[PDB]
Amino acid sequence: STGSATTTPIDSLDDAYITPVQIGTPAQTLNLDFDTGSSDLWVFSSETTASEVDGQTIYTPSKSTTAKLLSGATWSISYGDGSSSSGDVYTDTVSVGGLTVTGQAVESAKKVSSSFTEDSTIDGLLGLAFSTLNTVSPTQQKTFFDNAKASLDSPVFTADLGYHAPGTYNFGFIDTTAYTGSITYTAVSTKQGFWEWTSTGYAVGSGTFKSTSIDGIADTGTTLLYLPATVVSAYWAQVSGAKSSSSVGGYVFPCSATLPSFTFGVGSARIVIPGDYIDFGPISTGSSSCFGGIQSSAGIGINIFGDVALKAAFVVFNGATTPTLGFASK
Ligand SMILES: NCc1ccc(C(F)(F)F)cc1
Ligand SMILES: NCc1ccc(C(F)(F)F)cc1
Known part of the structure; x- marks a missing residue:
């Protein structure tokens, strides 16, 4: 069924x-x-x-x-x-x-x-x-x-x-009509009970792809993308006027800025998050400071591929005896 x-x-x-x-x-x-x-x-x-x-x-x-x-x-x-x-x-x-x-x-x-x-x-x-x-x-x-x-x-x-x-x-x-290209499958660890996988790296905007292992969980229940401080700092360094705000609790940016895209690796494939997906709007009504959709995982203890990342892709949760995660562009 x-x-x-x-x-x-x-x-x-x-x-x-x-x-x-x-x-x-x-x-x-x-x-x-x-x-x-x-x-x-x-x-x-x-x-x-x-x-x-x-x-x-x-x-x-x-x-x-x-x-x-x-x-x-x-x-x-x-x-x-x-x-x-x-x-x-x-x-x-x-x-x-x-x-x-x-x-x-x-x-x-x-x-x-x-x-x-x-x-x-x-x-x-x-x-x-x-x-x-x-x-x-x-x-x-x-x-x-x-x-x-x-x-x-x-x-x-x-x-x-x-x-x-x-x-x-x-x-x-x-649904093979819901995505383009091929689905790339990657291994899942269940040792912590999560859909846990390892991304193969990232790129900011049109920059060079940085091959580096990022262990994280696929979590439809979390809104944002939480990544290591080094990655998140490299992303926001490309946004003029962006800064980490302790009073707000994360990176904010001038609402008039244009945000660069963010690419994450799945095996040899690449998933591109459009910059518009990373804009979460004004921190308060009427403010000209906007809240960023990519934030540091340092305080959380685990990297979280939340909705910001997942909605850029078609995501297969394969619950076979050896579970796997599949990502396709759409
Ligand atoms: N969406 C459920 C959930 C909530 C919190 C966490 C954390 F923060 F413990 F990683 C994982 C998953
Ligand atoms: N990650 C699980 C989760 C989902 C929703 C909420 C909220 F927003 F409804 F409070 C909290 C925690």
Whole structure:
């Protein structure tokens, strides 16, 4: 079987992407943030503290005839940006774009951090990293992808994120009309539970390509591109007036500047991020200082190929027994 769903940016800056997901019987449709950097499927629900809900659509397990409480199970997650949520666990039927999984763990939030409350457009997260990162205790739970794998035509899913436009997540098949050229596959390490791979180097604008190994993770759940300080300094050195701002928390640049493109290596292939993808607009309303889409990973401890990079490519997440990542131009 296969599944296909449209994913839509939540604002004019592509800060995140939401995908409709059907949960329960009869279906309750929630708009979830598909996150290849985490492995929990959690949702705002009828059990969430009412003061922590501000416009989100909630899952109501008591209205689903297929929902079952997973006795004694709890979950608690903390994200790299400091976000967190926690609650109890139901199992229920979950469908994505026609692809249905029965008995999926649906983690019901009793408490969420303020950054989720303030994001009225995201009803929850759907984790697509490896199941070893799932936070359910005492019995760890499988991801939607892991549960669907056996019935998929091919054990893959693909991410085709749009620049200021809708995109597509496909499960079980590779749409050969959605990219140009060939797909370049590269090895994945699962030792930390992430879709972790090694880029072969980078170039700034029309400069020379620098061959150098950059270990990082493919993370649809992270907005920006986080790279080592040496790389990020070399990029922003080419933007007149750009500087690292401690008060803002990263590199900013004059909004009137034109940004150079950024190229990253995948094996012998090259993925080019247009300079316009790196503009995240004014730091505050009316400001003439703009926030950059490429920032240093020094404080994070790991390099993150977030949406800024992934949306320049057609990305194949191959969940075969030896997992691989595929990149194509589009
Ligand atoms: N998108 C989920 C996520 C969040 C944080 C991290 C970090 F910061 F720990 F690397 C990885 C993945
Ligand atoms: N990387 C996972 C993640 C995704 C979204 C959010 C936000 F923006 F909704 F708070 C936080 C963390």
